[PDB]
A paper describes a structure:
Following incubation with 50 iron atoms per cage and stoichiometric amounts of H2O2 for 10 min, native mass spectrometry on intact protein cages indicated an average mass of 257 032 Da. Relative to the unloaded particles (256 118 Da), this was a mean increase of 913.6 Da, corresponding to approximately 10 Fe­(O)­OH units per cage. The overall structure of the iron nucleated particle is largely similar to the unmineralized structure, with a Cα RMSD of 0.37 Å. However, within the pore, we were able to model 11 iron atoms and 19 oxygen atoms in a 3-fold symmetric structure. Moving along the 3-fold axis from the interior of the particle outward, the six oxygen layers are stacked in an ABCACA manner, with the four innermost layers (ABCA···) resembling a cubic close-packed structure (ccp), while the 4 outer layers (..CACA) are instead hexagonal close-packed (hcp). Residues in the 3-fold channel that interact with the mineralized iron include Leu47, Glu50 and Glu54. However, in contrast to these prepositioned main chain carbonyl groups, the carboxylate side chains of Glu50 and Glu54 are rotated away from the nucleation site in the unmineralized structure, implying subsequent movement of these side chains into the nucleated conformation as the reaction proceeds. Overall, we see that DPSL utilizes a preformed, 3-fold symmetric crucible that is rich in precisely positioned carboxylate side chains and unsaturated main chain carbonyls.
Residue numbers in the entry:
A (entry chain K), B (entry chain L), C (entry chain D), D (entry chain C), E (entry chain J), F (entry chain A), ...: 14 to 183
Write the structure that this text describes.
Amino acid sequence: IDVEKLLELLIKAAAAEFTTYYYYTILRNHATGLEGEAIKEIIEDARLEDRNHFEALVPRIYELGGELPRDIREFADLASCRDAYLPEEPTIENILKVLLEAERCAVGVYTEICNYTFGKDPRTYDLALAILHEEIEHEAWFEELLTGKPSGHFRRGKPGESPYVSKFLK
Amino acid sequence: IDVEKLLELLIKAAAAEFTTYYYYTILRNHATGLEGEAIKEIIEDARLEDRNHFEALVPRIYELGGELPRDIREFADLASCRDAYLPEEPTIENILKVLLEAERCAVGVYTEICNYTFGKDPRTYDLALAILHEEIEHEAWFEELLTGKPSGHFRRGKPGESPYVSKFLK
Amino acid sequence: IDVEKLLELLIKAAAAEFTTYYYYTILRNHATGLEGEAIKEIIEDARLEDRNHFEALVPRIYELGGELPRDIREFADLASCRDAYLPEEPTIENILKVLLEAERCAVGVYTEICNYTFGKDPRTYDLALAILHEEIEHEAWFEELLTGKPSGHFRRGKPGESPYVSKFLK
Amino acid sequence: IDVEKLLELLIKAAAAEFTTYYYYTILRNHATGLEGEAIKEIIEDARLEDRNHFEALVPRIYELGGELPRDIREFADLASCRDAYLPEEPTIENILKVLLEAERCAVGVYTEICNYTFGKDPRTYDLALAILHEEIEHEAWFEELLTGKPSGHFRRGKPGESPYVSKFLK
Amino acid sequence: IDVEKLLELLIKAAAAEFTTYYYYTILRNHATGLEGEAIKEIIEDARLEDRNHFEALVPRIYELGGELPRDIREFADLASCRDAYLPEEPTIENILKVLLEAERCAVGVYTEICNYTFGKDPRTYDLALAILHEEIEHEAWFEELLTGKPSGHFRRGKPGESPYVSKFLK
Amino acid sequence: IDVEKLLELLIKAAAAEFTTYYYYTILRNHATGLEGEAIKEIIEDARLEDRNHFEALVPRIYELGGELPRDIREFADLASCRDAYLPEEPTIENILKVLLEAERCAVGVYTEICNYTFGKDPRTYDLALAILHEEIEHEAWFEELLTGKPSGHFRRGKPGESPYVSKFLK
Amino acid sequence: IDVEKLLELLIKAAAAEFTTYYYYTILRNHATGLEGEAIKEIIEDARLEDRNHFEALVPRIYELGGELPRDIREFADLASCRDAYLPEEPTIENILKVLLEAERCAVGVYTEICNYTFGKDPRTYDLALAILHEEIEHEAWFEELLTGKPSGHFRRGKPGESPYVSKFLK
Amino acid sequence: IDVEKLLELLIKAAAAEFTTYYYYTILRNHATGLEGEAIKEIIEDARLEDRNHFEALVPRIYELGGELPRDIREFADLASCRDAYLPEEPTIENILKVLLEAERCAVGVYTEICNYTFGKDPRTYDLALAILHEEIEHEAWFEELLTGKPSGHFRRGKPGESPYVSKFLK
Amino acid sequence: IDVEKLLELLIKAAAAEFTTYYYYTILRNHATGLEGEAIKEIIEDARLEDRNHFEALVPRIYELGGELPRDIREFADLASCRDAYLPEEPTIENILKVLLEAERCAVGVYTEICNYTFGKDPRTYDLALAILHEEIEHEAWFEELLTGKPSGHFRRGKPGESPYVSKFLK
Amino acid sequence: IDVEKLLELLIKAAAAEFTTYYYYTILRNHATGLEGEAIKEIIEDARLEDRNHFEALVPRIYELGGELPRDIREFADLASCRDAYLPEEPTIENILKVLLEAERCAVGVYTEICNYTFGKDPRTYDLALAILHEEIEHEAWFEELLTGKPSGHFRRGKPGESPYVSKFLK
Amino acid sequence: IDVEKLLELLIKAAAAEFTTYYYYTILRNHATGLEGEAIKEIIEDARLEDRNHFEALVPRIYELGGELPRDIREFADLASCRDAYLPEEPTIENILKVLLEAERCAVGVYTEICNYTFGKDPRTYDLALAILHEEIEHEAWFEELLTGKPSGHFRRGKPGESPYVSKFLK
Amino acid sequence: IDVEKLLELLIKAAAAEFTTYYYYTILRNHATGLEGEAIKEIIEDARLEDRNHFEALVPRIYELGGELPRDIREFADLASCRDAYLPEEPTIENILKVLLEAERCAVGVYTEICNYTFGKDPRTYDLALAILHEEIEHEAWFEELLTGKPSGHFRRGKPGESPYVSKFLK
Ligand SMILES: [Fe+3]
Ligand SMILES: [Fe+3]
Ligand SMILES: [Fe+3]
Ligand SMILES: [Fe+3]
Ligand SMILES: [Fe+3]
Ligand SMILES: [Fe+3]
Ligand SMILES: [Fe+3]
Ligand SMILES: [Fe+3]
C-alpha cells in the first residue's frame, strides 16, 4: 500500500466532510415552510454525522504520518466533492437534488478508499467502511425523499448518533 | 365462561397481531416522499405496539390452557382481520385506507373479547382492555391523518412504548 | 356494598400477604442444591411482590375506615390462607407443593374480593384486580416448575418489580 | 350509551380540572407560616395532578367527537365543581376546608362518570377510574390534614407524578 | 420603578400565558391531515413552554407583593394578547396565522417589560428576558412554517423543555 | 464465641426488626393532622430501614447454622423489644414516646451484639455495627422531635435508603 | 455481484429469522419443569435476537432494490431453514436438538452470504457478519447445554441485547 | 470601573458566604422539635447554596487579579454581613429572625455589586445577578415562614441545587 | 440599533468560531510529549466550546434576517480574528502563545458586541454575554498555563460542556 | 505490628486472588450441560470479585512500602492457596469441591490477616475485613450448591459487584 | 470513655477539616503553569473530601452532646493542625510540602481518635476510621507527587467522591 | 485454515494479554512524581483494555475447541511478547520504552492473526481486528508521550472502555 496515496485520499475525504458541515448548515436553514419541515431534521442528522466523520478521520491521518493543511482555505480546496451550494432557486426539490448529489459523491469516496485498503490496511479499511455505512444511509434518506424509492430507514435516535462510526469517536 | 370459545378468540387476535407486524413493515417501507415522511413514524409506532400485543397475548393463551398452532401458516390463517396488503396503487392515501381498515377491525376484535369476559374473567378482560386502549389510539392516529377528524393524540415517546399494555410485558 | 364485610376480607388478605413474606423467607433459604438453584430466584420474586401486596392493601383498608389489629399475633391469626410451613421432608418437590398451594389460595382470595366489589367499589376492585394479576402469575410460575404445564412467563426484571400493583405503591 | 350526555359530563369534568389548576395556585401561595409549610407540598402535588387530569381528558373528548368550547370563559363556566376561591379569612384551617370540599366534589364527578360508563364504554370507564384513583387519594390527603382521619398515604415521589393516569399522558 | 405598574404588566403577561395554554390546546387538535402533522409537535412545544411561562411568572408576582385575581374569569380578561381563537375556516394556513399573531404579541409584551425594568429591577428583567428568548423562538418557528423565512431553529429535545426559563422553574 | 448464644441474640434481634415493620405501619397511619405531617415521613424512613435490618440479619443467621422459627407467632414472641403498640391516647406526643422507647431498645440490642462479637466474629460484628449506625440515627431523629435535643441529621434521600447496611442487602 | 441472487439469499434469510421468532415462542413455552428452567432464558435471548436480525435485514433488502413478498404465507415458505417445530415428544433434550439444528442452519446461511459478498458488497458483508456473530453464539449456547462442549459464553445482559447487530438497528 | 473597589466588594461578599456556611450549620442543628422540622430542610437548602456562592465567587476574584486573604481569620473579619449567631434564646421564631436578617443583608450586598457593574463588567454583573436570584429566593423562604407573606416558592429539588448559579460552578 | 452593522459583527464572530474549530484541531494534535499532555485536554475543551459558539450564533444571524456567505472560503475570510496557525517552531510554549492570542481576540469580539447591543437588543446581548463568559474562561485557562497567573478554574466536566451557552444550543 | 510480616501476608493473599482469576476462568468454562448452567453465573460472580480483591490489595501493599514481585511466575508461586486446578474428572460435583476448597482457604487467609491487624493497623484490618465478607459469601454459595446447607444468599446484582470492597476500588 | 475528652478531639478535628477547605482553595489557585496542572485536580479532590469530613463530623459531635463554638474565629483557633498557609515562595514543590505536612497531621489526628475509641465507641470509631481511610489516601497522593514513592492510587471518579465516608453523608 | 495453528496463536495472544495485566500494574505504580502523573492514567487505560482483550479471547479459544493450559505458569510461559519488566533504572523515560516495546509487539501479534484468518475465519478475523484497533491506539499513546510523534488520540472516557472490543465482552 502506498501510504502517501492513501493519505491524500483520506485528507480529501476529511476536507469533504468538513465543508459539508458548513454547507449543510445553510441548506438546513433554507428547508422552510410545511414541506421544508419534512426534511429539516434529516438534513440535521446528516450534517452532524458528517461532522463526526471529520472527527473520526483526523486521528487516522495523524496515525499514518499525515497532517492537515496549514491553512483552512487550502484544506477546503482539497475536498473530494463539489461544494453543496445552495441552489439559485432554493426550492425543497432543488435542495434535495444538491443533498443527493453530495451524498452519492461521498459514497463513491469511501468506496474508493475501501477498495484501495481491502486486505492491506485493516484499521483504515474498517474506518472507511464505518463511514461508508453512514453515507449509504444518508444517500438512502435523500433518495427516498426525492424520488420515492422505498427504503427501510428511520430518523436516528438522537441527531448525530453515528451508530457505525461512534467506536472511532472520543 | 366457555374457555374454549375464549381461547379461540385470543388465538385469532394473536394471529392478527403477528401478521400485522409483517404487513405494516411493508406498508412503512412504501410511505415514501415528502408526504410519506408525515406517516412513516406513525406506522412504526403502531407496528411495534402490535408486536407487543402479540407478546402480551401469548402468556394468557397458555395460562388458560391453550397453545399456539404447530405451523406458522396455520397460525396466519387464523387472523381475525384481513391481511393488510399493500394496495395495488400504493399512494399515501391508499396506504392510509388500508391502515385505518386494519385498525378498525382490531378495535372490533378486542371490543368483542371485552364484552365476552366482562365480569367473568377479570385478568383476560383487563388484558383485552389494555390492548383496546392502544388500538383505539392507533385508529385515532390514522383517522386523523386520512379524514382530518380532530384528535388530541401525539406520537409516542419512543416507538413501541405501549403505555397501556407494558404492565403485561416482560 | 357492606363495608364491614369488605374490610374483613381486605384485612384477612393483608394478613395472608404479611405472613407469606415471613414463610417464603424460610422456603427460599431451603431451596438448596443444584435443583434448588432453579427456584430460589422465583421464590424471591414472589416473596417481594407479596410484601408489595401488603403495602398496597394497607392504605385502602384505612381509606375505607378500617384498621390493622393492635397486636401482630392477632393479625397473623386472621390470614385467609394456611401458613406456608416448611414441609417435614423439605425436598424441592415438597417445597413447590407448599408454594403452589399458597398461591392457589391467594388467587381464590382476590377472586372473591373482585367478585364482591365488581360494579360497586371501583377503586377496591381495581386494587384487588392488580394483585390478582400478580397472584395468577405466581401460580403459573410454580405450576410450571412442579407439574410441567406450559406457560409463557419469565422471571421479573428486578425482584419485587410488581408491574401491576406498582401504581398503588409509594 | 348517550354520547352527547357523556361528552357533556367529560367537558364539565375537564373544566373543573382546568380551573382547579388556577385556583390551587392561589391557595398554595397562601399556605404560609410554619403550619402552612405542612401543606404547601401537598397542595402542589394535587394541583399538578389535576393539570394532568385535564391533559388526559382532552384526547378522550376529541376521540368521542366532542370539542372544547371556543372561549375560555365559557369553558370555565362549565366546571362541574364550584370555584375553589381563597377564603375571606385565609387561615390554614379555612384553606383546608376549601381543598377538601373541592376534592369531594371531584370524587363525585368521576364516580358519576364511572357509573354511567360501566360495562358500556370501557376506554372512558378506565380513564374515569384512573382519575378517580387520584381524586380519592387527594381527598384522603386533605381529610387527614384537616380532621385527623388516619390514612396510609404519603407524598408523591415527584410532584405531579400521577401514578394512575400517566398511562393516558403523552 | 413603579411597582404597581410593573405588577400590572406581569399579571397581564401571566394571563396571556395561561389562556394561551387553553387556546393552543384547541389549535393543536385541529392541526389535522398530512400537512397538519407538520405543525402539531411545534404547537405542542409552544403550548407547554407557555404553560411554563405562567409557572415562572407567578412567584415573581408574589415576590413583588402582587396577587392573582380572585376569579379565573377576571384573570382571563386581563390577558395582554387577544384570545387565539380557532379560525372560522380552520385550515392549516389560517391556524398558522393565528399562532404567528399570538407569538408576535407575546414578543411585544416581554419587550415592553424588559424595557421598563432594564437597569432597575434585575431579577424581573432577567425573568422577562428568559421568557423573551422563548417567545422569539416561538415566533421564528411559526414565521418559518407560514412565510418560508429561513431560520436556524429545530424542535426542542422534549416538549416543554424551556431551556431559557427552566432556571426559574421548580 | 458461643455460637448458640450468638444465634439466639441474632434471632431475637431479627424478630424485633420484623415486628417493628408491622407496628410502625400502624404508628405511621396515626400520625395525622398538621403536627402529624411533621413526623410521618420520619416514621416511614425508620420503618423501611428496620425492614432492611431484618433482611440483612437472616443470611447471617443461616450462615452461622441457625434458622428462623417454624411458626411466625413463635418468631414474634422472640422479639428482644416490647411491641411498639399504638398508645391508648394516640396523640403525636404519645406516639413519639413509643417510637423513642423502641429505638432506644434497638440501640441496646445491637450494642450487646457488638460487645459480644468484638474481636471474635468480625463479619457478625460488622453487620451488628452497620445496623447500630442506623438505630443510633433513628433514635436521634425521634429524640430531636420529642425533646428538642439538637442533632445534625436530615431525612434520608429516599425512604429505606439504609446507607450503612446496604452493602449487606441484595 | 449478481444483485438478484444476493436479494434472494437475503429474503430467504429474513424469512428464516421471522419464522424463528414464531417457532421459538412455542419452544420457550414448553421448556417447563426444573430442567426446563435452565434453558427458558436462553431460548428467549435467541428468540429476541433473531427478531432483531429480521429487523436488520429488511432495510438492506430495500436498499438493494428488493422487497418483501406481498403475502406473509409466501414469505414463510421462503425460509432458508426448516421450521423449528415442537418435537412430537417435547422433552427438554428433544427441544434442544431442534434448537441446535435450527442454529446450525442459520450459521450456514450467513456463512454463505458472507462468502458471496466478501470483497464485493462491503455493507452487506458487514451486516451478514454481524448476524453471523450472533448465530455462532446461539449455536454455542445450545451445543453447550445439549452435548456439554465447553464454551466461554454467558447469558446476555438484557434479552435481545444483540451486541453485534445493534449498530444496524433503529 | 475601579477594579480594586470591585475586588474589595467581591472578597467581602465571598467572606459573608463562607461564614454563612458555618453559622447556618449551627442554626440548622438547633431547629428542633415539631416546629423546627418545618424549617430544617429550608435552612439546609440555603446553607448549601451559600456554599455554592463562595465557590462561584472565588474564580472571578482571581480572574480580576485579586486573591483571598492569607489567613482564614482575616477572611472572616471581612464579611459584609454580621455573623448569624445563634440567638441567646434559640426558639424557632428567634432563629428565623436571624436567618431573615442575614438574607436581607445578602440581597443588599449583591444589589450593590450589580449596581456598580451594570453596563461596565458584564461577566461580574451576570455572576452577581445569578447569586442575587438565589438570595432573593432565600429571603422569600424565610419571610414566608416568619411573617406569613405569601410567596410562590417551593423547596429545591435537591439541596444545594443552585439553579441560577450552577452555570458558574465546576 | 443598526441591524446591518450588528449582522456584520455576528457573521464575523461566527467565522472566527468556525475557523477556530479547524485550527485548534491542528494545535491539539501538536501538543505532544509529557508537557503537551498537560494542555491537550484543555485545547480540546476550548475547541468543542468554540464549535458550540458557531452553532449558537447561526440561529441568531438568521433570526435577524442575515445569512451565512454562499461560499465557505468567503466565510473564512470574514473571521474577526487572525488564523491560529501552528507556529513555525511548534513548541508547547509557542502553541500556548497562539492560543492565548486567539482567545484574547475572541474576548474583544464579544465585548464589542455586548457594548453595541447593551440595552437595545436583549436577546443578542444575552447570547454575546453567554459566549463572552466562555471566552473569558478560555483566556484564563491559557494565561494560567503560559504565564502562571493564578486562577480558580478547572477542566470542564465533559469536553464541550458549554455551561453558559447550552441554553442556546439544540 | 511487624510490617514485613504483614507485607508478606498481603502479597501472598494478592497472589491467591490473581491466580484464582485465571483458574476460575477454566472452571467456569467446564460448568457445562443442564446442571452446569446452575453454577456458571455463580463461578463468574466469584471470579470477578476475586479480581476486584487483587485490585484492592495492590494499593495497600504499596502504601505499606511493599511491592509486587518482578516476575509474574514468582508472584504466582507465592499464592497462599493451592491452585484451583480443573479436576481430572471434571464433573459438576468435582468442580464444586475444588471451588469450595479454594474459598475455604481464602476465608482462612483473610481471617489470619484480620487477627494479625486487629487494633493495630485499622486501614489494613478494614480492607481484610471487606474482602473477608466477600469470601464468606463465596464459601456460602458453593457450600449451598454442593452440600445443601441452607443459606440466605442470592446472586449479585451485576457480576463483580463487590458490595463490600467497592469503597476500596477505583 | 471520657465523652468530654472525645468531644474535644472531634471538634478540633472538625476545625482542621473546615480550615483545610479554605486553605486548599488558595493552594489550588496557585498550582499554575505546566507542572501546576499535574496537581490541581489532586488538590481539588482532597479539598472537597475534607469538606465532606467536616460534614460527617458535625452530626456525631451533636449526637454525643457537643456543639460547635459560637464564633467561627474560635472554631478556627481549635484546629488540630497548623494552618496550611501558602508558602512565601509558592513553587509547586513548596506547595506540595505544605500539602503533605497537612495530610500527615490529619492522619495523626484520626489515628489518635481511632486509638481512643477502639472497642469503646463503635460508631465514633467507624467514623474516625472512614475519614482515616481518606486521609491515608490523601497523604499517599501527595507523597507520590513530591518524593516519588510508588503508590497504587488514582484520581477519584468525581472530585469529592469520598468513597469511604459517603455512608455518613446526607 | 489450520485450526491447531490458529489455536496456538490465540492462546499465545491471550497469555500476552494476561501477563500484561500483571506487569502494567507494576509499571503504573512506578509512574511517580510530577512527570509520572502525566502517564499514570494512560497506563491504567491500556492495562484495563488488555485485561478486556484476555476476556474477549477466551470464548473464541473455547469456541474453536481449544483450552487454556492447566497451570497458570505454563500459560504465562506461552506469552507471544516478552515480559514488560520494570526497568533496572525505572525513570519515566525508561518505563515508556518498555510500554512502547510491549505495545509494538502486541500490534504485531494481532496483525499476524488477521493476516492468517483474512477471508477464512470471519469471526476470528473480526475479533483480532477489534483488538488490533485498541493495540494501535495504545501504541500511538505511548509513541506520542515518548517520541513526540503527533497523534489525534485522547484519553478514554472511562478507563477500560474498550470501544472496539466491547461487542465481544459480557
Ligand atoms: Fe411530511
Ligand atoms: Fe438448577
Ligand atoms: Fe409545618
Ligand atoms: Fe407539620
Ligand atoms: Fe413541622
Ligand atoms: Fe503533563
Ligand atoms: Fe441448571
Ligand atoms: Fe502537568
